[PDB]
Amino acid sequence: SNPPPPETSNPNKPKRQTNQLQYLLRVVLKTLWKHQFAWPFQQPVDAVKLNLPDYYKIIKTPMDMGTIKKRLENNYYWNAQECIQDFNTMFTNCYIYNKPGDDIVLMAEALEKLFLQKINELPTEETEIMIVQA
Ligand SMILES: O=C(NCc1cccnc1)c1cc(-c2csc3c(=O)cc(N4CCNCC4)oc23)cc2c1OCCO2
């Protein structure tokens, strides 16, 4: 079976918004979301229908841009780097599970290159906008 998707809320985790996290949603995530190769990563992986053996034993932290989107919309992240690591995990999950040079790997690599380019547009100084304590 497929496990439930990753959490996008946590009662013990404070909610936070920064100017960096805003840019990640409005520009970085949006740019990747409109990319030609976004569609395999817009939702959690369906290992059953895709015939991916032992995907959730090897991939212990599944991640997708739909989860990242919901986490940004509901201020799940502590800061921008926690969001960046979800992008990073999404890419490396595909890299460690598939043969280098495979189609899905080429798609992930193209998204990561665009991701690195858009991340360079991030405001260097962090501006906290709001914190909602848990
Ligand atoms: O390829 C996909 N659809 C093929 C297809 C069939 C019919 C019609 N249209 C397209 C595919 C792959 C991932 C996806 C995200 S990560 C990841 C990974 O690590 C390894 C693999 N695979 C699957 C292919 N064999 C190699 C290993 O797929 C993924 C997610 C998806 C996909 O389509 C549906 C939406 O959600």
Author numbering: 43 to 176
Authors' account:
Of the four members of the BET family proteins, BRD4 is the most thoroughly characterized, and its aberrant activity has been associated with NUT midline carcinoma, colon, breast and prostate cancers, neuroblastoma, and hematopoietic cancers. BRD4 overexpression has been shown to promote tumor growth by stimulating transcription of major oncogenic drivers, such as MYC. In this study, we report the biological activities and mechanisms of action of thienopyranone (TP)-based inhibitors with increased potency toward BRD4 and selectivity toward BRD4BD1.
The indole ring of Trp81 flips over ~ 180° in SRX3212 and SRX3212P compared to this ring’s position in SF2523P, enhancing its interaction with the benzodioxane moiety. Because SRX3212P is a potent inhibitor of BRD4BD1 but not BRD4BD2 or PI3K, whereas SRX3212 is a potent inhibitor of both BDs and PI3K, we measured and compared cytotoxic activity of these inhibitors in three cyclinD1 dependent mantle cell lymphoma cell lines (Jeko-1, Mino and Z138), a colon carcinoma cell line (HCT116), a MYCN amplified p53 mutated neuroblastoma cell line (SKNBE2) and a PTEN mutated prostate cancer cell line (PC3).
